[PDB]
């Protein structure tokens, strides 16, 4: 029983990052993601008419470009928030989501035992299948000339709003109530589609 | 003050590779190893136990007409298949890699014991477990499962229907049948893994 809990905790409460020749490989919840390093370049450069579509990002002194890793973390947090829309485990999902969203630590700490007692393979399996579903929901999106309703997903915590938008440059990701944003290349999700 | 990033990573990789986590479900078992989930059916043992006392009985007399063969669980079959995939991997590399020692030890553990935790106390090998290594392992296991999936069911004109992996110490044979994969180990033990376990990876 200690065994299962520890195995699950190792996978769910650590967000591993390793540098590769292409960018980074990330490992979380037993899923690998390859994150390309191309990104900050284009975004910071245009700070390609996508610019005009997002003036609040590219023409705003109070916007902050984040790394592609940040973009992935935000997306995973969003997937979790998306499962959250569905009770004692609800708080665990909440805490892990919060940790992914708002911190940059690679290891989830507080509150160790509380959350840990709820961890199981069944729960991790649900988390993984829901994450893959959310990814395919992102993949379902259409790149569209204008803003449009059909090219983005929005999830809204009590303390944050996450917008993920599919563009010609890949997945533009933004977090608001100031604004933080980044870009995740579509390649990161290619293995799951 | 707190374990460096590399030490947390090594711990996580150790936990994924050295725990074979087995849980009961309504359909059989769900196994978790190397960050990979497998749904294993508990069924099929009756068939085997009957045959052991057709074309199948004579096709595998060492299993079915041998009072000294021993039927194992499907979990054992999966363990043997994973062990075999690791041997397959380690044969493509050279001893000069930490990955070789690890693949070997993990494979021996999965293949020859039933324990669900592998007490790896060679600091040497543990200190070289990495996300790169685990990634290579996962890649190769899925590649191996795809080689198994592309086997034809044993047939009249000898279309490739099995894979054999030989160690200094064991011989592992995995054969495609109408009932899924018949797995055997000789130095005889055998079982059957229903093919649904591999369906998600096709």
Author numbering:
A (entry chain B): 15 to 61, 70 to 108, 113 to 203, 216 to 231
B (entry chain A): 10 to 62, 70 to 203, 217 to 231
The authors write:
VP24, one of only eight proteins encoded by ebolaviruses, functions in virus replication and assembly, and is thought to contribute to immune suppression by binding to a certain class of molecules called karyopherins to prevent them from transporting a transcription factor termed STAT1. In addition to its role in interferon antagonism, ebolavirus VP24 has also been proposed to associate with membranes, and is important for assembly and function of the viral ribonucleoprotein complex (RNP), where VP24 binds to the viral nucleoprotein NP. VP24 adopts a compact, single domain, α/β structure of novel fold (DaliLite v.3). The overall shape of VP24 resembles a triangular pyramid of dimensions 73 Å×30 Å×30 Å.
We subsequently determined structures of SUDV1–233 and RESTV11–237 by molecular replacement, both at 2.0 Å resolution. The exception is RESTV, which appears to be non-pathogenic in humans, although it remains pathogenic to non-human primates. However, microarray analyses have shown that RESTV has a reduced ability to suppress host immune responses. The entrance to the hydrophobic cavity (11 Å wide) appears to be gated by two residues (Y172 and M71) that point away from each other in RESTV VP24 but toward each other in SUDV VP24, appearing to block the hydrophobic cavity. Mapping of sequence differences between RESTV and the major pathogenic ebolaviruses (SUDV and EBOV) onto the RESTV11–237 structure indicates that RESTV VP24 differs in ∼30 sites. One of these sites, a cluster of residues L136, R139 and S140 (in RESTV), is next to the 142–146 loop, which is important for binding karyopherin α1. Residues in VP24 that are unique to RESTV often colocalize with residues that appear to be important for karyopherin and STAT1 binding, or are important for virulence in rodents through an unknown mechanism.
